[PDB]
Symmetry: D2
Subunit: 217 residues, 4 copies
Amino acid sequence: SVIKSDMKIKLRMEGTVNGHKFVIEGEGEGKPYEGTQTMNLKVKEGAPLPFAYDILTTVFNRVFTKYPKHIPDYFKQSFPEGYSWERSMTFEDGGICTARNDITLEGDCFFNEIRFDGVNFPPNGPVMQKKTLKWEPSTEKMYVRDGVLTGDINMALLLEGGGHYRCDFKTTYKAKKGVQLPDYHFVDHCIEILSHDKDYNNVKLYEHAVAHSGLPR
Amino acid sequence: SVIKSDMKIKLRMEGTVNGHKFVIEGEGEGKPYEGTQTMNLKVKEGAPLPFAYDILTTVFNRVFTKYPKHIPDYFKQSFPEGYSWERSMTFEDGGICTARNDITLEGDCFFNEIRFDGVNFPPNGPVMQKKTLKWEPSTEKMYVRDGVLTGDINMALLLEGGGHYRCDFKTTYKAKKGVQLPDYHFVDHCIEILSHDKDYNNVKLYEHAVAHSGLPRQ
Amino acid sequence: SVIKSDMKIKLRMEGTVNGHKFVIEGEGEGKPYEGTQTMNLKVKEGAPLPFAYDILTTVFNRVFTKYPKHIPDYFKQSFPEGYSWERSMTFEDGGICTARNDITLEGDCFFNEIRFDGVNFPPNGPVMQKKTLKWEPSTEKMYVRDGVLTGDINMALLLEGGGHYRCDFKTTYKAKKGVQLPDYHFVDHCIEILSHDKDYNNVKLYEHAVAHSGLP
Amino acid sequence: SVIKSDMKIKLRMEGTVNGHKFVIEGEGEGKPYEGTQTMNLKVKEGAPLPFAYDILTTVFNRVFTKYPKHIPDYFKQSFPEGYSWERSMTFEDGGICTARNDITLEGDCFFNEIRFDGVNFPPNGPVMQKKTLKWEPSTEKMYVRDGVLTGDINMALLLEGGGHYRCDFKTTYKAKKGVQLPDYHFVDHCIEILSHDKDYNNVKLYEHAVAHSGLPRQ
């Protein structure tokens, strides 16, 4: 209700991947009730990035999810006070990332204070060799664990040359105040880089997300 | 084509869980094109089972999946020759199961030769203390690796008291002949014990499964 | 003690790997207090095995461990009644094996009833392509968890052509009767195939194992 | 050779655990050829830390390892140019840390630029409730992986109540210049908090580490 049909987004990511430091800023907008957002992202420090940009994109806000009425919306309920999230990204070849986002709201704009760290990517792996094409669509499994909303995802990057590179996500979402906790449910996702320049200094990103209860009997 | 709108199922599972031996036999029926099936299961050896019956139920055939026309159906294409599958179940508390099913077709009936082995369940955990209620519905991520089909699933058992117990599935599906391989896709599942006696010596089991391509950009 | 300086071993393993059924029988001897044992293994069903024999060898008894007096010996204390163990083997490429051994003692001979099952080995990986040379030596981390003794190991197979192939072991060891529980400790291992014929239908296997408390 | 019998250590860690930001500074000394070191650590920002100090201590340099003549010493050979390492810590309850250290040498002093980040610790788990007593001793398995020297460790925190809380370490070690790589080998460790104040704002830390070849063949 402080959550309007149209909202703005501003973000700052600082991070390190296999020792390479960088800073990326973003500005965009979205439709919280349609579960859509688009952002323009600019590398401010650390160009040219030496790793696959796709590892960053799901870190660049579950407010942008179409929740049906019968599933409590943890994220929209969190505002105006907001929420933070932490995530582990466990890639099948030993690469591990940690990420976090503290999300605040000022007027019609979400502010996103992000940290991203990646370690142990193999040097001839698809991330350091920039072999990724896109994330496949996914279904996130949302459940409450010790009062903490948790999402687990089987994620996969499609590779140049045709196979997949798997990553397991675990995100913990924490509202700053008391909200109605949902029961077990799902969030479907599609995320796409709509356009980019050669070194990904400039990227236009899109996400669509929809919450649901899964297949009925 | 040898796959009809209505088909029968016969099954035999032999296995162990934390060293406890058992044999379970099943007979049922299903609708391959509607992605539904029902089975009656009877414990033949090992009763009363000293572990949560729910760990077995997803081992009790992706033929019973509604596949849309634009996704190649790995499972239906494999018949009459058939297919086998192997699975690991990695529970969050260190319990690990291995399972396999070799699936043959005689006339209108699928035959299922199953092995199941579970190790390292904590003695006070929800499996050995029978504290599970059901599997939540799930979405399996299907993709080709090394010329065969892999499915990964984030599975969760609902527990007595309201929490969840997580398990990660990885299944390899292997056709006994060459089929049109599908691109990355999804299978949604719902599996339910419709009825059971107190010790789960007799169980009526139901599954619904539908394949799809996930959320579009639109 | 019923545990003598020299003891005999008989074993039967039944299992499946990638759907391939097999049975292997063994007979051997060892020195429980020296932490050594040797076994002759014969494939009885399922020859020739289509997978790396090395995945089986650590399934073919922690009785054969030199324990220093300051660490309770869970395994020797388990006899005469015996113990069982269960194991998961999580290979880095998704291959998973479950294994169990029910160990009894009749006179001077351990009997070993073994089940082994392996799934999800990639068809061109080192197990299905028989590209393994040996297990590296290891250190197992032993700790009591649910009143039950647990061992975790970072294992590695040396490969033909030079690399390693990693496997994580978790074993639970369960005495039939109450035994003194040890504090956290370590068991060092070395396992070797001493000799084998072309398709590993006949294998002579050796293990040395020594318990310790780690670096002071 | 630029590596002397007595060396000094200076470090700065910046990090976040559970969203809580902190900075810790360290000064110490050690005996690289004996595999020992001691450090004084002071929280500069973020006092009091709301999590178990023990999760930090192994991030506060394998130069401080007694290497026998028959195993190439990747770490001492990497100087004067130096080396970096990266680590993942996978705890058994889903807590995950990433850490890195860029190690330089100026005169007789190693300088350590450290980042540490921890996520998904359960609020009532032993790290957020500060229920850890110490790390157990450990044996690290060291091996080359596609040219990267890698260490894997089964680590365990002893807990209030007498159980253990397991963590799996994977560390990648990268020399700034080409160095002779070792064969598969082991490093034994013991790490101890010698003393601390009530909120661990001030900590004295000790490590002992010794490389070896494991049990001989034959």
